[PDB]
Each structure stands twice: as C-alpha cells, then as structure tokens.
Design an enzyme around this catalytic site. Structure first.
Site, PDB file in Angstrom:
ATOM      1  N   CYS A 148      25.725 -36.192 -67.554  1.00 21.25           N
ATOM      2  CA  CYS A 148      25.210 -34.875 -67.958  1.00 21.25           C
ATOM      3  C   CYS A 148      25.121 -33.962 -66.750  1.00 21.25           C
ATOM      4  CB  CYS A 148      23.840 -35.021 -68.655  1.00 21.25           C
ATOM      5  SG  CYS A 148      23.940 -36.161 -70.045  1.00 21.25           S
ATOM      6  N   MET A 149      24.815 -32.704 -67.006  1.00 21.52           N
ATOM      7  CA  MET A 149      24.699 -31.702 -65.953  1.00 21.52           C
ATOM      8  C   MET A 149      23.704 -32.145 -64.871  1.00 21.52           C
ATOM      9  SD  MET A 149      24.233 -27.556 -66.425  1.00 21.52           S
ATOM     10  CE  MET A 149      25.401 -27.701 -67.727  1.00 21.52           C
ATOM     11  N   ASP A 150      22.584 -32.723 -65.319  1.00 20.71           N
ATOM     12  CA  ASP A 150      21.462 -33.030 -64.429  1.00 20.71           C
ATOM     13  C   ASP A 150      21.003 -34.491 -64.427  1.00 20.71           C
ATOM     14  OD1 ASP A 150      21.299 -30.051 -64.322  1.00 20.71           O
ATOM     15  OD2 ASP A 150      20.338 -30.320 -66.304  1.00 20.71           O
TER      16      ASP A 150
ATOM     17  N   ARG B  91      41.913 -29.608 -33.396  1.00 15.74           N
ATOM     18  CA  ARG B  91      41.097 -29.088 -34.504  1.00 15.74           C
ATOM     19  C   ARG B  91      40.783 -30.177 -35.515  1.00 15.74           C
ATOM     20  NH1 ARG B  91      45.461 -25.755 -34.703  1.00 15.74           N
ATOM     21  NH2 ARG B  91      45.882 -26.470 -36.835  1.00 15.74           N
TER      22      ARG B  91
ATOM     23  N   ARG C 116      52.586 -21.661 -45.420  1.00 15.46           N
ATOM     24  CA  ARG C 116      51.579 -20.694 -45.877  1.00 15.46           C
ATOM     25  C   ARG C 116      51.809 -19.421 -45.048  1.00 15.46           C
ATOM     26  NH1 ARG C 116      46.002 -24.149 -46.113  1.00 15.46           N
ATOM     27  NH2 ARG C 116      46.494 -24.014 -43.898  1.00 15.46           N
TER      28      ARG C 116
ATOM     29  N   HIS D  42      50.007 -25.699 -37.794  1.00 14.95           N
ATOM     30  CA  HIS D  42      49.305 -26.687 -38.622  1.00 14.95           C
ATOM     31  C   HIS D  42      50.321 -27.610 -39.273  1.00 14.95           C
ATOM     32  CE1 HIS D  42      45.748 -28.213 -40.584  1.00 14.95           C
ATOM     33  NE2 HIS D  42      46.169 -27.904 -41.799  1.00 14.95           N
TER      34      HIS D  42
ATOM     35  N   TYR E  79      25.553 -37.580 -74.520  1.00 10.78           N
ATOM     36  CA  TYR E  79      26.325 -36.683 -75.401  1.00 10.78           C
ATOM     37  C   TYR E  79      27.534 -37.408 -76.008  1.00 10.78           C
ATOM     38  CZ  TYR E  79      23.738 -32.702 -73.377  1.00 10.78           C
ATOM     39  OH  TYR E  79      22.791 -31.816 -72.976  1.00 10.78           O
TER      40      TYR E  79
ATOM     41  N   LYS F  82      34.491 -25.507 -41.305  1.00  2.25           N
ATOM     42  CA  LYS F  82      34.750 -24.725 -42.531  1.00  2.25           C
ATOM     43  C   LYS F  82      34.087 -25.396 -43.752  1.00  2.25           C
ATOM     44  CE  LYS F  82      39.399 -26.611 -43.912  1.00  2.25           C
ATOM     45  NZ  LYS F  82      40.501 -26.584 -43.037  1.00  2.25           N
TER      46      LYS F  82
HETATM   47  C1  LIG Z   1      21.124 -28.089 -70.788  1.00  2.00           C
HETATM   48  C2  LIG Z   1      20.164 -28.268 -71.869  1.00  2.00           C
HETATM   49  C3  LIG Z   1      20.088 -27.304 -73.008  1.00  2.00           C
HETATM   50  C4  LIG Z   1      21.147 -26.245 -73.227  1.00  2.00           C
HETATM   51  O1  LIG Z   1      22.376 -26.864 -73.689  1.00  2.00           O
HETATM   52  P1  LIG Z   1      23.644 -25.927 -74.008  1.00  2.00           P
HETATM   53  O2  LIG Z   1      23.157 -24.808 -74.917  1.00  2.00           O
HETATM   54  O3  LIG Z   1      24.120 -25.291 -72.715  1.00  2.00           O
HETATM   55  O4  LIG Z   1      24.630 -26.859 -74.645  1.00  2.00           O
HETATM   56  C5  LIG Z   1      19.037 -27.436 -73.915  1.00  2.00           C
HETATM   57  N1  LIG Z   1      18.081 -28.375 -73.762  1.00  2.00           N
HETATM   58  C6  LIG Z   1      18.033 -29.273 -72.750  1.00  2.00           C
HETATM   59  C7  LIG Z   1      16.886 -30.258 -72.677  1.00  2.00           C
HETATM   60  C8  LIG Z   1      17.206 -31.735 -72.696  1.00  2.00           C
HETATM   61  C9  LIG Z   1      16.188 -32.380 -71.827  1.00  2.00           C
HETATM   62  C10 LIG Z   1      15.295 -32.926 -71.076  1.00  2.00           C
HETATM   63  C11 LIG Z   1      19.073 -29.234 -71.722  1.00  2.00           C
HETATM   64  O5  LIG Z   1      19.055 -30.103 -70.701  1.00  2.00           O
HETATM   65  C1  LIG Z   2      40.880 -27.602 -42.366  1.00  2.00           C
HETATM   66  C2  LIG Z   2      41.787 -27.378 -41.248  1.00  2.00           C
HETATM   67  C3  LIG Z   2      41.841 -28.318 -40.099  1.00  2.00           C
HETATM   68  C4  LIG Z   2      41.145 -29.663 -40.102  1.00  2.00           C
HETATM   69  O1  LIG Z   2      41.844 -30.566 -41.015  1.00  2.00           O
HETATM   70  P1  LIG Z   2      41.340 -32.076 -41.181  1.00  2.00           P
HETATM   71  O2  LIG Z   2      41.124 -32.653 -39.782  1.00  2.00           O
HETATM   72  O3  LIG Z   2      39.968 -32.094 -41.880  1.00  2.00           O
HETATM   73  O4  LIG Z   2      42.405 -32.798 -41.932  1.00  2.00           O
HETATM   74  C5  LIG Z   2      42.633 -27.960 -39.008  1.00  2.00           C
HETATM   75  N1  LIG Z   2      43.290 -26.786 -38.946  1.00  2.00           N
HETATM   76  C6  LIG Z   2      43.295 -25.854 -39.929  1.00  2.00           C
HETATM   77  C7  LIG Z   2      44.046 -24.572 -39.732  1.00  2.00           C
HETATM   78  C8  LIG Z   2      45.124 -24.209 -40.735  1.00  2.00           C
HETATM   79  C9  LIG Z   2      45.143 -22.738 -40.856  1.00  2.00           C
HETATM   80  C10 LIG Z   2      45.157 -21.460 -40.954  1.00  2.00           C
HETATM   81  C11 LIG Z   2      42.484 -26.087 -41.127  1.00  2.00           C
HETATM   82  O5  LIG Z   2      42.452 -25.176 -42.127  1.00  2.00           O
HETATM   83 NA    NA Z   3      27.359 -31.954 -70.709  1.00  2.00          NA
END
Ligand SMILES: *Cc1c(COP(=O)(O)O)cnc(CCC#C)c1O
Ligand SMILES: *Cc1c(COP(=O)(O)O)cnc(CCC#C)c1O
Ligand code: NA
Ligand SMILES: [Cl-]
Ligand code: NA
Ligand code: NA
Ligand code: NA
Ligand code: NA
Ligand code: NA
Lengths: 382, 382
Positions: B311-313, B219, B138, B168, B265, B39
């Site tokens: 930052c985002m990137d 599972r 659930r 589960h 920022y 999943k």
């Molecule tokens: C993400 C970003 C924007 C836009 O900023 P927001 O309007 O979403 O606040 C503008 N300019 C740059 C260039 C900086 C570099 C390299 C961004 O990365």
């Molecule tokens: C995600 C999940 C698992 C596995 O769990 P983990 O091993 O990663 O802890 C097993 N069974 C179910 C079924 C529950 C329902 C409907 C999962 O969703």
């Molecule tokens: Na940011």
C-alpha cells in the site's frame, strides 16, 4: 528562494481542478463531511498547498498517514481537524495532544499503552477514531467485544474522546460482493455501541459508487486529484473528474545522430539513418522511471518516442526536424483520453496511477495555478 | 539541529562508509582531484549532509545535475568548487556567477546565448567546463573545430574562464572496447587546443577500471555511496566498497489470519491455514514500490515474505510466531551479500541499484551516523 527554479522541468498543479473535484464529492454527499485525504504529500501534489486551498473552499477535516504529515500541516497554517490514519508510536502521544491531531486506535493494547504514556504536560483532549477491520486485513479491531471495550476504556478517562469510528474497503474499485459485505459488517459492529460523532468507510471508489447513508463522512483521496481509482469505476460512474497534474520539460537542445551512432548508457539505441534527437532535463531521479523507455511524449504537438536508456537527470526523445530548443514537452498530460495520461504512464510502469504520482520526486518544482495567480514550490531551495 | 520523526520507518546513512569510499578513490588516483558526484540529493542519501562530511575529509570539488542543487549546497555552507553537469537555461547565467558555480558548456550556441544574458550586475568570474561528446550521444561538442572555436570565444572575454574539459562514458560498466575508444577520442580532441586546469572523464566504473593518466580529476558517484556500478565491475576489481544505506522499519503489530481471510487491496493473498502477519509502517509512497510484493525482508533475523498488495503507507509481511511489535525489519541491508542488498531489490524492481536509491522518498527520515554521533533530517518538518 523556494519560489524560483533553475531547470526547465516541473509539475503544473491545477488547484482549481482539485477544488472542483472536492465540490463534486460535496455535492454527491451533501449530508456528509468530506475528510480530504492528503497523505503522501497529497499523492505528490504537495499536501500543504492542497490542504490550504481546500480550506479556502470549505474543507474542515483532513486525513494523513503519519503524525509528521499532520504536524507539517499545522506548522503551515492548517487549523482544520486532522486524523492520522496510521498507528502512532505510544511514546509520541503527547505530541499528538499538543498539536490537536486526532489518532487512529488499532487495538485495545495500543490504547492502554497510549494512556500509560500521557505525561500530564499536555492537558487538552485526545481525539480518537477507532479503526475496524472488516476485510482489509491490516491493523484494526475485528470483533465487536473489543470495539465495545475500547469505547468503555475511553469513557473512563475524561481526557480521551471517542470522536469517530471507521473501516476501509479492500475491493471497492472492482465488481463483487466484498464491498457490500464489509459495509454491512461495519454497521453490525457500530450498531452494538454508542455512536460517535464521525462514522466513515468510503474511499474514492466507495464515495463514487455508493451512498452509504449510515456514514456521515467520506475519505476521498485520488479522485480529489482528478483520477478514477480504476477503469471499472470510470466505466460505472457519470461524474466527470478533472485531472490536476501535468509533467512538463523543455527541450534543452536538439542534435542529429548519423547512422551507426548510439545514444545513452549501454548504447541501447543506434540510429539506422539520420535521426534528430532532443535532450530533456528530466530523468529517473525525478520519478520518470527507467521503464519509460519506449513511451511516447508530446513534443509541441508531435508524438515522439523516448529512446535509449533514461538517465538519472536526462531523457532522450526522437523528434521531427521542426522540433527546436525551448519547445515544451508534455510527459504527463491533464486529460484522461491522452497517450500521456497518468493511466497510460501507469500501464508502461506496470503499476497503478497512485504510484505514478507518488514517484514524482522532491527535485521537481510544483507550479500551482489558482485562477490568474501562480505559486512555485521548489523543495531544494527551502 | 536534529529533527524529530514520528513514524518508525527510516534510512540509516553511514557517513563513515561514505568517507571511507571517498578515501578508496583518492588512494586509487593519488594525483587527481576527486570531484564527488552528489547530484539527485547524493543519490537519495542527502547532498547537504554528504557534501559537508566529505569536505571534512578533504573534498574540494562537487558535481551536481542542476543549479538548484548547487545553490542548495551553497545555502547550507558548502564552499567547495561546484560544477553543474546539466545545461543551465541561459537566462539564469547571473545566478551561477553570483553563487560561484561552474557551468557545463554543451555547444557554441549555448555559450553565445549565455554571454548575451550576462547583465554586468554580477562581475565575478564565470567558470566553464566544456563538455565533449565522444559517444554518449547526449549534449556535447563532437567536433574539434567547434571545440577550438568555443575556447577562442572564452578567450575574448576576461570574465569567462576555461576551467575544465570533460566527457562521459556510455558503457564503462560493461565489457567492450567502447570505453577505450571514447578515452582515445577524448585525448585526440583535447590535444588539439590549450589544456585547461581540469581534465576529467571517469565515472565510478571508469575510476575503478582505468588509470586515465591524461585526466587530473575523476567523477565518482554511486561507488562513493558504496555500490558497484555493475556486477561486471564488482567481478573485475579487488577494492572493497562499503554500502552506506539501510532501509529500516519496525513492526507496528502482529495479527493472526485464519484460513480463508485475505489481506490488503484486491484480496490478492488469502491464507490457507493460520498465518501470523506483521504490519510495517512503510509503503510505495516511501519508495518501497508495489513490485516488491513477493520479496523477502529480514525481520529480527528471520527471512519473511511480503504478502498482499503493498500500500501507499503500509506493507504486510508473513512472519513466524516469535515476531512481535517493535521488532526491527531490514528492507535494504548495508551488505552486498544479502537477500536485502540494494542489488537484489533492484532485480525485484527490474531496474538498477541507482534507481532503487533515487526512489526513496522525502517522507523517509535520514538518520546519519558518524561514529557514535547520530543526526536526523526529516524533510516534512524542515
Ligand atoms: C489512502 C486512503 C484513503 C483514500 O483512498 P483513495 O480514495 O485515494 O483510493 C481512504 N482511507 C484510508 C484509511 C485506511 C486506513 C488506516 C486510506 O489510507
Ligand atoms: C551521474 C554522473 C557521474 C557519476 O556516475 P556514477 O559514478 O554514479 O556511475 C559522472 N559524470 C556525469 C556527467 C555526465 C554529464 C553531463 C554524471 O551525470
Ligand atoms: Na494502493
Ligand atoms: Cl485498513
Ligand atoms: Na472520555
Ligand atoms: Na449519512
Ligand atoms: Na543510469
Ligand atoms: Na576568458
Ligand atoms: Na519515490
């Protein structure tokens, strides 16, 4: 089969709202090019669909973070100018040339390396925007002599074009002198050399708060999607932005817990008296993070608490007896004054609106609204 | 076949580690089917590649959260049995039949609705696993009479197959009697009716801590990918799990801040004396969230602090003078005993390892390792 989905959890993306916000910026800055920032998949809205819709409403220039993002736009029919804001590895320079993508120059050394990697197989012009650091303190040229030298290098190679120069504000979304100081420093550097075609420094906050007559392009991102970059900015400006995103899920079924019965991992919620709960087919793998436990969502008009641990794929909500299977739940609402606004969700997440949007994962279908017409993207079924 | 990528930030996914962890579970439970849980895109690793590799190592049954996930596997050649663990909308029943996907039955009402939506256009058997609620709270059937009635309904339709029954655990990764109580309740219910082919209750924690001889399938999810479900589980068991994920980025360039210069920022970090910094081409839109500020990453062997706002990137790191452009940075390490382990990252994020992995966004390429073979998936170019 990417236009179908098989679980009732999705994002509504209002493209008319996005186009309307773009027009607000165009109208605020009638003598500037609006370089729409569609990096990070248009902040989770879907960069391909957003950019295509913006081109239909007159956009001619986009900015993205990476060459992958630029190539993705080109492959899906975007013919506008595109600037990559990050630093491209020099070995990949021919791909930028081939795809007619403009690149950011962060330093003189990067440019020299880029030049060494141009093979001659791609003979078209390489469009360059020189990045100045005026206070952000990431990559960028800080001194005027370096800026002049980079321009002089570009002038010695017919294939290289000095298309633009830019900087970026660190604190435009808060009060203080830093933003004005950065803008003045930018002008001081740009005035010491020949001016290129595009001169740009304003993000959303800069674009909303300042005219910056010296610049002839702006780079709004988050406010295109309908969000103020900060509360301070919202309080200072008169322009109305239209939120473009809802996050929706439908109740799968309701169930009655009796006193002493717990719910979800860790048994972190236990009913004290007969309690109706609703199961929602959305969880933290969708970007509705674990910290959302204790939030309120809007179940068919009723404010309802998220109880127990949020699971990877499922969320439990405490609901009144009127709630039934199939009822719509708004988890993120397209109104700023809402208990499900992106900003309220950001406060619950101890973060900013930008991150709430970026968190929304590939598993969520995006359902686009443009007038009467509806389009679905479901990345799983690509 | 293999995608290109144009930014040096990526996930390494060690398929050999995944296969090795799958073999650990098969060896722990030699008379059970290992229903590998893939999943949420195999918890960020990539469900198509993981499932294909597991089939090559003997896997015959997968579990996913949604029909979209099951169809994605089928469209990319997976021929194993697949169970959808979530509740399918009844209107979509024919698609499950068409794609030979088994479904979870949460209630009598769901089954009746599903039956009404079978058109007759898809005539193949519908494989059903009945979900019992033994404490998770659930969806699922909690009473024996209802369980028996659902089986009796299935027995009236030749097309419908009672393939499995399951429950589960809520708290299998923590000390307490809840898990033993749930297991006994499961047996008490299943012993009151005819037994189906598959009987399953154990997640990773259950599979590591109990034999559950009554069950004939397990599972495991997170432990296939090499992570213990909790510290308690790690402390209790001797089996060694091999972490499968690294998160890597290369330094784009380094730069020297002087005293009084800020970064990123909000100008949230200001240098007190000459400080070398490194820019990394990864940010919170990749899943390296803003809360990671103040963490340590491993830059070519040196422990280095993330400084200023993420930052985002882009992410900024404080580095020694030996660090240069092109150096590899490990942000998530494939070792449990590491300051960059997924668990340490989860602690910085105030969350659990599951969510750290799910946060890793579509913008990160996955680079798969199988011996000396290397294969790249980059969703942006797909
Ligand atoms: C993400 C970003 C924007 C836009 O900023 P927001 O309007 O979403 O606040 C503008 N300019 C740059 C260039 C900086 C570099 C390299 C961004 O990365
Ligand atoms: C995600 C999940 C698992 C596995 O769990 P983990 O091993 O990663 O802890 C097993 N069974 C179910 C079924 C529950 C329902 C409907 C999962 O969703
Ligand atoms: Na940011
Ligand atoms: Cl910058
Ligand atoms: Na030139
Ligand atoms: Na101007
Ligand atoms: Na969980
Ligand atoms: Na039958
Ligand atoms: Na994410």
């Amino acid at each position: 089969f990417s236009d179908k989905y098989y679980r009732s959890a999705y994002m509504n993306v209002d493209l008319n709202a996005v186009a309307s916000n773009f027009k607000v910026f165009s109208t605020l800055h009638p003598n500037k090019t609006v370089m729409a920032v569609v990096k990070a998949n248009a902040y989770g809205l879907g960069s391909v669909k957003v950019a295509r819709h913006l081109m239909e409403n007159g956009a001619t220039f986009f900015a993205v973070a990476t060459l992958d993002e630029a190539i993705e736009l080109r492959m899906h029919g975007i013919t506008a100018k595109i600037l990559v804001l990050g630093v491209l590895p020099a070995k990949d320079i021919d791909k930028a040339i081939q795809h007619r993508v403009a690149l950011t120059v962060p330093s003189k050394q990067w440019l020299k390396e880029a030049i060494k990697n141009i093979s001659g197989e791609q003979e078209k012009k390489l469009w360059l925007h020189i990045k100045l650091d005026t206070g952000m303190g990431r990559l960028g040229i800080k001194d005027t002599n370096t800026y002049q030298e980079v321009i002089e290098i570009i002038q010695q190679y017919e294939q290289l074009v000095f298309e633009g120069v830019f900087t970026h504000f660190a604190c435009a979304d808060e009060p203080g002198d830093m933003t004005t100081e950065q803008y003045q420093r930018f002008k001081d550097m740009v005035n010491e050399a020949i001016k290129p075609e595009y001169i740009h420094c304003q993000n959303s906050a800069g674009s909303l708060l300042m005219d910056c007559q010296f610049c002839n392009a702006i780079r709004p991102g988050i406010s295109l999607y309908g969000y103020y970059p900060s509360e301070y900015v919202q309080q200072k400006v008169k322009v109305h932005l239209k939120p473009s995103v809802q996050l929706i899920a439908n109740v799968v079924q309701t169930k009655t817990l009796q006193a002493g019965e717990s719910v979800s991992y860790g048994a972190t919620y236990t009913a004290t008296d007969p309690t109706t709960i609703a199961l929602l087919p959305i969880g933290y793998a969708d970007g509705y993070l674990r910290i959302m436990q204790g939030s309120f969502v809007n179940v068919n008009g009723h404010q309802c608490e998220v109880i127990g641990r949020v699971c990877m794929d499922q969320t439990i909500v405490k609901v009144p007896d009127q709630v039934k299977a199939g009822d719509s739940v708004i988890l993120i609402d397209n109104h700023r004054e809402s208990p499900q606004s992106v900003e309220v969700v950001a406060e619950k997440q101890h973060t900013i609106n930008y991150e709430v949007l970026c968190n929304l994962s590939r598993r969520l279908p995006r359902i686009y609204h443009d007038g009467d017409q509806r389009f679905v993207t479901n990345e799983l079924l690509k």
